[PDB]
Amino acid sequence: NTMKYIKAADFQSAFKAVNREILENPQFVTDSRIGRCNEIGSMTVVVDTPSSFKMTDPRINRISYEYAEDFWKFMISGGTDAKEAFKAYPFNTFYGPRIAAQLPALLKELKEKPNSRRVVFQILESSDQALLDSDETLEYPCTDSVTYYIRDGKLYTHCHMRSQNCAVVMQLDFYLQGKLLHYIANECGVEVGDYTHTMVSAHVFERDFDYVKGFLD
Amino acid sequence: NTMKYIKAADFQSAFKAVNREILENPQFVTDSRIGRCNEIGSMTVVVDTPSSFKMTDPRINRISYEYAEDFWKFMISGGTDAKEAFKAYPFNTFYGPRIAAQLPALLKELKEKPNSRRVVFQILESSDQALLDSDETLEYPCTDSVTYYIRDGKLYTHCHMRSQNCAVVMQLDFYLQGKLLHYIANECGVEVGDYTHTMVSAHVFERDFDYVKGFLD
Ligand SMILES: Nc1ccn([C@H]2C[C@H](O)[C@@H](COP(=O)(O)O)O2)c(=O)n1
Ligand SMILES: Nc1ccn([C@H]2C[C@H](O)[C@@H](COP(=O)(O)O)O2)c(=O)n1
């Protein structure tokens, strides 16, 4: 039966378990906007040790960590010049500027209101709906929001994904989300608890099945 | 140990299981913005049969269904005059007008783009952050977003809650979310699949423990 809740010690184990389950026990096999995929709706993934956001298996190589680190610097710096930022790799929907806008208010709430439930970074917003009936290629944000809260000296993170390509782009999302929760934790002078990753659509495209089978076992 | 994933046949069973688990196996016991509570972070709840949104146990009575139906009419009508709407019960953050604004674009995507992953109603948005450092009493939206998708003739729903009072207001949230997914399903001419309810903070205030113990068993 389809397992929808996956607890793992580190990002890699979570990553492999999620991919394994979508390949073997999908909820849907479906034609999507960009091709056929196996899909599991409303997957919940928990990572016990979120300092583990750089995975170690070199066979998971479709997102290089040279690229992922360049992407991190690009998005934490809140820049808009992606053409220049990625020239070594061949209205906007960049996450960086949105995180930058919300940082002062959210950090204030997080540091000053004890045990707050209100610290939510919006990534996807309703103004992005102008992309739906368009022929633009801009990303309609796959990340819906990231919630942070501090209890008893520890920072807990919940990233809610509208849409997640679990074989490829999830490698990048994990890296970026891991870096960001550590940035937030360091700013607040607290330690890290755990990380939770929900995805309304958790999918692997059929064109990537062989790649996935390459890093399982 | 704290159970964070709860699958139930109907809303009531889910409702009772969630409350039971927060009372008996909380992750945190914490001082919040509005008093002490038991709390479980990143709870995931699945309801198999979402037509069951009106629960039947009369002991769960802090949200009357007379009130809940009045609230439904108020929010689906996209009104702003809550003073008049609720005169029988003693910038805005109303959900209704936000749902109304997004309905045309989201319905279009849902009906016209097959197997879309993009149909997300934003409730909580970053402009609401102006409430954080304020002395207004307006609700800072507890509901983050509601995602809808259709596969093989069935409508699936994922409601992501930033913050959920599981003993009291969850009775209202379930009713409203149940009515809305059926409104959406009927508009699209499709049947209903299942409903998923994630809550970054799932909590019961200590002042409501006796009320909860009243409807368990
Ligand atoms: N941060 C991101 C951005 C995008 N995507 C992936 C998910 C989908 O495979 C595709 C988005 O397509 P759609 O808008 O149809 O969901 O990109 C992702 O996994 N993570
Ligand atoms: N639709 C809603 C609106 C509000 N709340 C509850 C959750 C919290 O108990 C409180 C919001 O407080 P805070 O902003 O501190 O999370 O109201 C809820 O459960 N459901």
CSV table of C-alpha atoms and ligand atoms in Angstrom, one decimal, chain A residues 117-118, chain B residues 33-34 95 139-140 142-143 161-165 169-170 173 203 205, ligand 2:
chain,number,residue,atom,x,y,z
A,117,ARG,CA,2.8,30.4,15.8
A,118,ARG,CA,2.9,33.2,13.2
B,33,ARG,CA,0.2,34.2,22.6
B,34,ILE,CA,-3.2,33.4,24.1
B,95,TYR,CA,-11.3,34.4,4.1
B,139,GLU,CA,-7.2,37.5,12.8
B,140,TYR,CA,-3.8,36.8,11.4
B,142,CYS,CA,-4.8,30.5,10.7
B,143,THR,CA,-5.3,28.9,7.3
B,161,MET,CA,-3.1,25.2,8.5
B,162,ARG,CA,-0.5,27.5,10.0
B,163,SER,CA,-2.3,27.3,13.4
B,164,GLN,CA,-5.2,25.1,14.6
B,165,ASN,CA,-7.1,25.1,17.8
B,169,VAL,CA,-12.2,26.2,16.0
B,170,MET,CA,-11.3,23.0,14.2
B,173,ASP,CA,-12.6,24.8,9.9
B,203,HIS,CA,-2.9,22.5,19.8
B,205,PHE,CA,-5.5,25.0,25.3
C,2,LIG,N1,-9.6,29.3,11.1
C,2,LIG,C1,-9.0,29.4,12.3
C,2,LIG,C2,-8.7,30.6,12.8
C,2,LIG,C3,-8.0,30.6,14.1
C,2,LIG,N2,-7.7,29.5,14.7
C,2,LIG,C4,-7.1,29.5,16.1
C,2,LIG,C5,-5.7,28.9,16.2
C,2,LIG,C6,-5.1,29.6,17.3
C,2,LIG,O1,-5.5,29.0,18.6
C,2,LIG,C7,-5.7,31.0,17.2
C,2,LIG,C8,-4.8,31.9,16.4
C,2,LIG,O2,-3.7,32.4,17.2
C,2,LIG,P1,-2.2,32.6,16.6
C,2,LIG,O3,-2.3,33.6,15.6
C,2,LIG,O4,-1.4,32.9,17.9
C,2,LIG,O5,-1.8,31.2,16.1
C,2,LIG,O6,-7.0,30.9,16.6
C,2,LIG,C9,-8.1,28.3,14.2
C,2,LIG,O7,-7.9,27.2,14.8
C,2,LIG,N3,-8.7,28.2,13.0
